[PDB]
Design a protein around this ligand. Structure first.
Ligand code: BMA
Ligand code: BMA
Lengths: 858, 856
């Protein structure tokens, strides 16, 4: 009949290839173990209790040997009556990580060398009735490449040194292998050089025609119409007639149209195209700009006996607008003719072990983005291309994906074999992902050009080789990221833009400029470690990375640590800090101390760390939105985590929100007031509106003594054009304070519609550690709210950065890390299965002033 | 209703833009003078007798001012009431050379800055009933670019210095303007920095829909079927229905398919694609590999008003593969057409005139027929020229001459600014869309010699090592983007069934340019550089040879056309002006090669003939060697086919279309079945039977060793079976075996390939340079016979006569053969084609041979 597929994900065992030193050291791993597919031998070893959980305390080093070893997977499967007589029977590996040799009933069947490629092999003649034996050998990429690398004239500038000394300094095998770069350890992740059959394996069988894919190519989309072309790829083993029927369903569920096309297919590849025009399309818009409407395209193929394939897709135009203006050349994402200031963050993998990521976690990550008012995530090139399901959720929720190809910043080799291996990966990933409306941009890599131009080790490298070799290496990069990826996108996903490298100017000129293209800014946190107010002096056309570190939630810390470890410079805490080769808690202390002095205890440390991060990023993100149209994007580093540890994330490994993620919802709000005080004692006030209509609204400013008294009060009408930022005042300290003590005085700025409160920013005139913050009495009052509750908070005085917690009880909050103002109640919604009485007793309430009180000197 | 178009080519006049010093110097140019459109102001001046013909003697210099000046074209044209009532009225310029500013009824209309671009402009609101005043101002690219260039930190390497000192040394404006590189002077052509409206101008008007193009996109083609997509590009002003009908006609003009598609168009651009599958297609094949079968696709577009417009494409169904596979010689490079690996046999094609606008269809056709007649299957259209006229490509489709199409970059390092890059991208798009449906265009190529120059030419090396390394990286990046990304992407987007090639010679940016074991090669160590003996050709065997050559002078009639008796000396000022290699001192290099083989020419006419013999025989060695080496090499494109003006060059056919000896030899060394008998410098003669047939060749070959005095020394004959598409070595003979102590100065060997009694191919081998031989004194008998339209001329020599050359003074006549060897006693009949009377022909007939030329 039609094609069939059977998944070979069960019955798998695994062990060390016989003869390795690791087999003597780990004899249990020399014998067969149950193996997960999809999975990793690493997680297989963990499940079998041969090694302890590498995420817990200091166990990271105990599993490093597995990445240095060669592995042998085995399974047995049966092929039945019907299957063996089909005209085609193929084995299909969706993911082999990475250097793989596949054997079927003892005969060599496939060599593989790309974690991101799908491998399809003709199996029919080698199969048999009943028991078949499938074997997959996986070779350590470190062990494989290093002996070859040791013999080379030079090693290309790579990624991170091994903390375990199993690779030479500045001689990294990772740049020579198409494998997720973060597997080799990063500056927020452990070194887990995974080996695995990390995606599904199938037996597939078919007769006359195989349906190789469906793509809805959008040719032009506007409000009047969408002209699309449904493109069907068909493999035929012989020449014959086919009949294709295409059904098109609206977002409402209605029936838009039915379309048919007859064709004769010929042996090999065949393309059958059906044009569809939709009048007055219900287009797909990013979050905050309308509905995430989508159409469904269902095609059937009758050959000489039918077959079904379905594509859900969203109609929209995408333009990367780069227009000359007074700040140079712009960079802005334009969806359905709407210029969208990009609001979001950088997305890294969801786990050190990618095969074990649940749908729930993928969905949760995106819903977190959504709830924090983000409209774009950048999928950073040091990770892996995501699961289909992840992209489904981004389509549904309206989170735009800026999709890096998976180059993380190492300098690639220029040999043809590497290039062509990478091309086929690119083609496969672009074909896989192209029909997701959320995928609006493709980007060749993370930071390769800017590293080559600005990082000391690249600069030293490129000047130490002969200039003729430098040209070869640069020609390699230019071709890979300027031609190969660009052409794959142009061929297979032609309606979306391509970008050579982030950050860059698409190879027009140099990387990382402030008046053209995008920028990653790291002079704050990294490098000279400048004060966070320096963020106010940087304004590129698009900021695609910047950030600050903080510790995860308390619950998360207890999850990888035990009381003996509860110190910023404990061995276990050090292991969980990956920045600045293990001594990055000093950098964190630097920033914490500047604003808050010395934390009283480890609890306050975690909190202050999250405040330092949250308040720092608020400065930058607000500054950038306020600068429109000078800037048109803010993607902070980073959204998420791979493991329990310190990082730049706003949401930790267990989905727990940091203070940053709650602040993010505010500074990314559709209507926002920015009031940002610079180091010159100048406070600039702007009203920002992402609305497509005019905003008629008022704003007010109030100057307050911390003793509770009002000093001055101003209010004005405001008319803000659509999609703009309007500067509405610029106030020196003298103007705001008069002779009032800066250490005892603050300012409140609010934006209102009618008198519904849209946004608020509270301004201070000194580092918090120098303030005379009042001691707040905060009043709790609960109330049923259906399945959840309403918690109302009232403070007699200013309370800064109020943090609500419930110990180990499970409850999430509509808001947290907020300011309370004198006599002004704030109600949050508490979601929890726990009863009112238990949330009563569990509730802990922390604030800045109470936290700073009783603190030691520095 | 349906779109209408009026060509605005009549009634132009032209003059210097007022206010220039040249207006004082050339008062007649300051006044209005008739202008020809298409044309050049240069040729308008010549027609007006304001300057003498720059092709004649040393008149080149007298017209240089015109390239340094700004020009004002003007014409009046009428627009009727109906046109003004169409929904759309546009002016279209197919070609402005180059920096142009267009004005209509005194209002600025269009700025243009690319010779190779088409410019369409909305004109309707500016037009008026009755008379309209159209003006085009053209600005000298030199005068415009040089003051800017002078303020730059460096100038990019590229092109030729001005022999007239009107641009500083190694600071060339041409690099920065999109204009035919050879206009600024080249090493076989004069400096004619043309300004002109050099292609047609039209007023076009349309209502509901404008049909912007038809393209037949070949998806897959084999013997069993061709799956194609007829792609219609429709411009609409308003939303509404269209019905498209498509007729498909086979090579015999009979309908092989009929198709219908309805669609609704919307404002702007629309694509209507019709899938067509042709069962058992009659595919297009290159010359020598079958018929040049073509299908005609006729589309009719009924718009929403119910009006119909027709558009047509004649095309050829064929698969093209650039096959590059690892083998014992490295990595191959061969073009494969309809599954047949074709050894490429041909030459490099340059423009047909220094003034491309006056080239006739007749000259285009004749150029391609010459190639056909010399057994060529491929011309490379070299990037220093211009994209050719539509008609030229039609004729190539017709005759089966494949075109290797360079984009028009000739070797200069280009600047890396975005504006230049995007200007060029639009030129690429427009050219690829215009040319894509010619089956003859089988490959697109980024440029001529940019990479190999950058890597191997002293001035580029010096230049790139002199700038800051960060600047070197910026320039290299600009190149790699332009030639590696932009052009590749245009071809992939708009002509995706043909291969793209970043640069000739090269490896497509995989690695370095000009390798012997990967990609193609331009080889110039013979003629150029160290100037090696021509037998060194036997030592050079790249995977594909896409340029190489030797110079010669043009036909004596062509020489007489541009020089007078007083000028007939190779070092006369006039002959030097017409020698453009090495700053006019190329006759030194020419004499080097001539003297090496033949000694000192007797007189000037002997100099011309020996120059042609030197070139013919030298190229013979190389071309024969490359074919005999198959599959090590899989292409021979010699530099060059043709000329842009009368002068010394590497061409085999001169500016007036007169065949040189090389062209007659080319027909022999490119013959489908060929015997190669090649003696190297160590006295070893390798004999190969070369067969381009797609079937086994069952044949015999033979050899006869002869004394100059007529005696027969030895003979041997042998049956041979030659595989399809192959070269078979069938002997290697030392001088000792061939000569057996006979004097090498007094002995020759004849090699022959036969099929049955039919002689297919003959090679005559010698054992010493001609100037060392004891060539016998030949007595050549000639006898004429009427042959219907023309005449049969039978020549019979009593001794060997080498390289017999037939001519008729200034009497016109063409020959079926020339520059041939006569063997003692063996008559050769040549067909003589001529309007002239037999009486005049017999009277004018001159017979030259090598021994008599060398006899002093
Ligand atoms: O250093 C924090 C992060 O900053 C980003 O810009 C990239 O360089 C990442 O690879 C890195 O992990
Ligand atoms: O030197 C003769 C010719 O050689 C070719 O390879 C190119 O370099 C041409 O530009 C040149 O005119």
């Amino acid at each position: 009949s039609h094609m069939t597929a059977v998944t070979l994900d069960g019955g798998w065992r695994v062990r060390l290839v016989p003869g390795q030193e690791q087999g003597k050291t780990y004899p249990k791993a020399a014998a067969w173990l149950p193996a997960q597919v999809p999975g990793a031998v690493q997680t297989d070893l963990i499940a079998a209790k041969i090694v302890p959980d590498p995420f817990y305390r200091d166990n990271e080093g105990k599993i490093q040997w597995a990445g240095l070893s060669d592995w042998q997977y085995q399974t047995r499967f049966t092929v039945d009556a019907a299957t063996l007589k089909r005209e085609h029977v193929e084995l299909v590996f969706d993911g082999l990580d990475t250097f793989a040799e596949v054997t079927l009933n003892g005969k060599q069947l496939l060599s593989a060398d790309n974690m991101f490629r799908q491998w399809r092999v003709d199996a029919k003649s080698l199969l048999k009735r009943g028991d078949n034996l499938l074997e997959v050998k996986l070779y350590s990429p470190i062990k494989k490449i290093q002996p070859w690398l040791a013999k080379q004239p030079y090693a290309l500038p790579g990624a991170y040194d091994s903390a375990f000394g199993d690779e030479p300094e500045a001689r990294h095998s990772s740049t020579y292998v198409r494998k997720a770069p973060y597997n080799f350890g990063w500056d927020w992740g452990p070194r887990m050089v995974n080996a695995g059959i990390w995606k599904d394996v199938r037996v597939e069988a078919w007769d006359a025609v195989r349906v190789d894919g469906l793509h809805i190519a959008q040719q032009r989309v506007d409000a009047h119409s969408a002209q699309v072309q449904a493109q069907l790829d068909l493999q035929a083993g012989r020449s014959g007639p086919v009949q294709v029927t295409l059904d098109v369903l609206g977002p409402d569920g209605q029936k838009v149209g039915q379309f048919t096309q007859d064709a004769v297919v010929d042996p090999g590849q065949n393309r059958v195209d059906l044009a569809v025009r939709i009048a007055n399309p219900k287009r797909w818009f990013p979050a905050g700009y309308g509905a995430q409407d989508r159409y469904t395209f269902v095609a059937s193929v009758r050959d000489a006996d039918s077959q079904q394939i379905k594509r859900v897709t969203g109609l929209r135009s995408v333009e990367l607008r780069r227009e000359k203006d007074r700040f140079g050349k712009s960079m802005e994402i334009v969806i359905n003719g709407i210029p969208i200031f990009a609001k979001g963050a950088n997305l890294i993998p969801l786990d050190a072990f990618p095969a074990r990521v649940t749908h729930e976690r993928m969905r949760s990550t995106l819903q977190d983005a959504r709830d924090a008012n983000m409209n774009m995530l950048r999928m950073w090139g040091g990770g892996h291309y995501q699961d289909d399901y992840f992209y489904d959720v981004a389509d549904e929720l309206g989170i735009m994906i800026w999709q890096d190809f998976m180059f993380g910043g190492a300098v690639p080799p220029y040999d043809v074999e590497f290039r062509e291996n990478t091309r086929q990966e690119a083609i496969e990933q672009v074909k896989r992902l192209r029909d997701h409306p959320s995928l609006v941009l493709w980007c060749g890599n993370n930071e390769v050009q800017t590293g080559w131009e600005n990082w000391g080790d690249r600069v030293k490298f490129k000047q130490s080789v002969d200039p003729e070799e430098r040209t070869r290496i640069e020609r390699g990069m230019t071709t890979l990221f300027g031609t190969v990826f660009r052409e794959v996108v142009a061929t297979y996903d032609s309606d979306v833009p391509y970008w050579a490298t982030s950050p860059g100017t698409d190879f027009d000129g140099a990387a990382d400029q402030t008046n053209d293209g995008d920028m990653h800014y790291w002079k704050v946190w990294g490098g000279p470690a400048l004060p966070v107010t320096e963020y106010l002096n940087v304004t590129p056309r698009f900021m695609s990375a910047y950030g600050l570190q903080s510790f995860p939630d308390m619950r998360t810390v207890r999850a990888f640590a035990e009381p003996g470890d509860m110190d910023p410079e404990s061995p276990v805490m050090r292991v969980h800090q990956k920045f600045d080769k293990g001594n990055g808690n000093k950098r964190l202390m630097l920033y914490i101390r500047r604003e808050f002095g010395e934390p009283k205890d480890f609890e306050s440390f975690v909190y202050l760390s999250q405040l330092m991060q949250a308040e720092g990023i608020n400065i930058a993100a607000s500054h950038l939105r306020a600068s429109r149209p000078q800037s048109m994007g803010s993607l902070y580093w980073q959204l998420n985590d791979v493991w329990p540890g310190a990082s730049w994330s706003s949401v930790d490994y267990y989905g727990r929100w940091k203070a940053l993620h709650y602040h993010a919802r505010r500074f990314y709000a559709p209507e926002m007031i920015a009031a940002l005080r610079n180091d010159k004692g100048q406070t600039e006030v702007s009203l920002v509106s992402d609305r497509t209509t005019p905003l008629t609204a008022r704003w007010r400013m109030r100057v307050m003594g911390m003793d509770g008294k009002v000093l001055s009060k101003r209010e004005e009408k405001a008319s803000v054009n659509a999609l703009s930022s309007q500067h509405v005042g610029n106030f020196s300290d003298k103007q705001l304070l008069g002779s009032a003590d800066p250490k005892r005085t603050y300012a409140v700025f609010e934006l209102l519609d009618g008198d519904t409160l849209l946004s608020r920013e509270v301004v201070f005139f000194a580092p918090a550690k120098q303030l005379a913050l009042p001691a707040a009495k905060i009043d709790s009052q609960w109330r049923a709210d259906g399945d959840g509750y309403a918690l109302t908070l009232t403070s007699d005085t200013l309370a800064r950065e109020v943090w609500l917690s419930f110990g180990d009880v499970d409850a999430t909050l509509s808001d947290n890390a907020f300011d309370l103002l004198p006599g002004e109640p704030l109600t949050v919604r508490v979601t929890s299965k726990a009863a009112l009485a238990q949330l009563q007793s569990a509730l802990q309430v922390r604030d800045l002033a109470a936290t700073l009180a009783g603190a030691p000197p520095e």
